[PDB]
Amino acid sequence: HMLGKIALEEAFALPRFEEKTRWWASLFSTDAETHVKEITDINKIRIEHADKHGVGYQILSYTSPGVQDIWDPVEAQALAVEINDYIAEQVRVNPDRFGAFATLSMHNPKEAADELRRCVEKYGFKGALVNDTQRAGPDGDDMIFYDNADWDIFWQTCTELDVPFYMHPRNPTGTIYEKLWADRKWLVGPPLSFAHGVSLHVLGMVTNGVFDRHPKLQIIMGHLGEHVPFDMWRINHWFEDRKKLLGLAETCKKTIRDYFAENIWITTSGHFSTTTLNFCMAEVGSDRILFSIDYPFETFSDACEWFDNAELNGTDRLKIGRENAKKLFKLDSYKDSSA
Amino acid sequence: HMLGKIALEEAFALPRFEEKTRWWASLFSTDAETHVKEITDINKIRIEHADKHGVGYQILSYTSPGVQDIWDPVEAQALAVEINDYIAEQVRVNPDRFGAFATLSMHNPKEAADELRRCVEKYGFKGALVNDTQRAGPDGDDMIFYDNADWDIFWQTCTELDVPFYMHPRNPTGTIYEKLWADRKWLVGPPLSFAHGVSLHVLGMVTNGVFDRHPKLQIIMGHLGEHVPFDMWRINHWFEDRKKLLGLAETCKKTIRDYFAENIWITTSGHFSTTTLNFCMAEVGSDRILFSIDYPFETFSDACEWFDNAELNGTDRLKIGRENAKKLFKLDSYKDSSA
Amino acid sequence: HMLGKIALEEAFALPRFEEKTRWWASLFSTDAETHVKEITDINKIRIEHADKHGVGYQILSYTSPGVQDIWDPVEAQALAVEINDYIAEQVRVNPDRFGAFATLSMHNPKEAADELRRCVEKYGFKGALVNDTQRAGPDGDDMIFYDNADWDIFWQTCTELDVPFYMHPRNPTGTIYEKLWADRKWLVGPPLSFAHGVSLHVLGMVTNGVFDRHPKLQIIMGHLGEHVPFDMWRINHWFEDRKKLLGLAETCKKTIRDYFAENIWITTSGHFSTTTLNFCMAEVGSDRILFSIDYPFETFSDACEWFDNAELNGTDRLKIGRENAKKLFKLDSYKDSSA
Amino acid sequence: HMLGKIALEEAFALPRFEEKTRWWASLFSTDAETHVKEITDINKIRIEHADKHGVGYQILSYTSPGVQDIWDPVEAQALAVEINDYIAEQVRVNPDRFGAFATLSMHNPKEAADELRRCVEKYGFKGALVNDTQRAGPDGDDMIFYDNADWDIFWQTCTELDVPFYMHPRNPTGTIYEKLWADRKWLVGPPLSFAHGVSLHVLGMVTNGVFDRHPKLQIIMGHLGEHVPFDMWRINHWFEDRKKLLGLAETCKKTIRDYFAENIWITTSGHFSTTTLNFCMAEVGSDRILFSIDYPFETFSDACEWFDNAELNGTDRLKIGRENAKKLFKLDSYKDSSA
Ligand SMILES: [Mg+2]
Ligand SMILES: [Mg+2]
Ligand SMILES: [Mg+2]
Ligand SMILES: [Mg+2]
Question: What residues sit in the active site (chains A, B, C, D)?
Answer without folding.
Answer: 252
